[PDB]
Assembly symmetry: C2
Homo-oligomer: 245 residues x 2
């Protein structure tokens, strides 16, 4: 069992400190504990770097602006992430999950609280990369695809992606879609958002759930029935993994 | 500025420990920090006791059952609260606010996290007890009364209570309404839930916002206009304060 790496990221250009995972870290009056404002952003770590860091950085800033939190200084968050990555791989280490957390902070100090955690990618996610997910359709083993009757919305914590020939389609609503469409378009794929239906999913060459850390997982079941197997499955798995890298 | 009193309440009949408010308390992998399940219940402290503790206890258990959290052992929570109260008044002291927090706990241990905090009733709440609240009507200085057109729903963090003669009325949907109706009925008041309208509020003798800690506050403004002043205002303030005591 690998040891998690935890770093405290002080706001307003403050210190970056290592946190012992076996000691407490958050105070009683932190907004994170008192139903106050907090945001998070989760990134994949592979081979000495944080993946798709610029898009994750932009989204973390947008989340902070929405809640009226102090604007995160991305240079500090990215520097702390890299220090955490170097500590993680200096031991002894495979892919990791990095979550950035920012809260409004302690009510007694008025300073935001920020930290990141680096942990191994779960065995559940690695197995699903190789074997797939059983999906459940629901109004607005082991995921949920939200629907509005026949219309497809999104995965529980992921983006639905369908493939048909050289066409890539996603439902009309993220960091996943932007990275996938930018890389897939460069490779000749024809990408577009569409008002997807359940029939479109049953008629597609393949249906996938895609997210930053779990990466691409094939949808083998949607309430039932075997969703076929494409001749280009290996190529698609490599395409999406590279796009999110 | 009084020192907060914090106690850790271990689940499954574990230890009750004092927490230093100036030292960290919560670990990185607690459900309270990782968007996991947590509940809270807030109680008023006055003259050596927790007010309306049985009803707060019942609600805390109902909240835990809803989220599938381990059933709180109320004897342990009430004993820890009393220890906290005794520490609070042994110094060095007026009314206090006590919040019970229960989370699913650390993912690495599988044991729920529980703690309580005792802090002074805020000066904002004490001033509003004496001077009132300016209310805003909104769809589903300084509060919000939710509405559905002309229908009255509830306060932002309180119960709307109207008075007209010997009649007490609340909107049809809590610990506040049950304590108020039980005590007011014993004193001859005629209590009922009703599909209240904005017109009912403008036509009432008085309109109040009532909650466990702030207690009864008069509604002097609802988007505008002076909401009169009853001859029995002193009596009503005493009635509701006693009901919630």
């Amino acid at each position: 069992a690998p040891t998690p790496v935890i770093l405290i990221v002080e706001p307003y250009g403050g210190s970056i400190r290592q946190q012992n995972p076996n000691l407490p870290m958050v105070f009683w009056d932190d907004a994170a504990l008192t139903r106050g404002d907090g945001i998070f952003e989760t990134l994949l770590i592979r081979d000495g770097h944080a993946c798709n860091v610029r898009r994750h950085g932009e989204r973390f800033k947008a989340s902070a602006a929405l809640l009226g939190l102090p604007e995160p200084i991305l240079e500090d968050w990215e520097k702390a992430t890299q220090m955490g990555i170097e500590s993680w791989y200096s031991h002894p280490a495979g892919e990791a999950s990095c979550t950035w957390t920012l809260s409004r902070g302690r009510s007694s100090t008025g300073l935001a609280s920020g930290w990141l955690t680096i942990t191994p990618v779960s065995s559940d996610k690695l197995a699903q990369r190789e074997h797939g997910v059983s999906v459940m359709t629901s109004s607005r083993f082991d995921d949920v695809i939200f629907t509005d009757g026949d219309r497809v919305l999104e995965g529980a914590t992921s983006t639905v992606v369908s493939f048909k020939g050289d066409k890539i389609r996603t439902p009309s609503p993220g960091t996943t879609q932007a990275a996938l469409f930018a890389h897939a378009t460069e490779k000749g794929w024809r990408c577009k958002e569409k008002d997807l239906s359940i029939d479109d999913l049953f008629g597609a060459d393949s249906v996938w759930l895609v997210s930053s850390v779990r990466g691409p997982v094939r949808v083998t079941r949607l309430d039932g029935h075997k969703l076929r197997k494409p001749d280009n499955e290996k190529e698609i798995k490599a395409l999406i993994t590279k796009a999110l890298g």
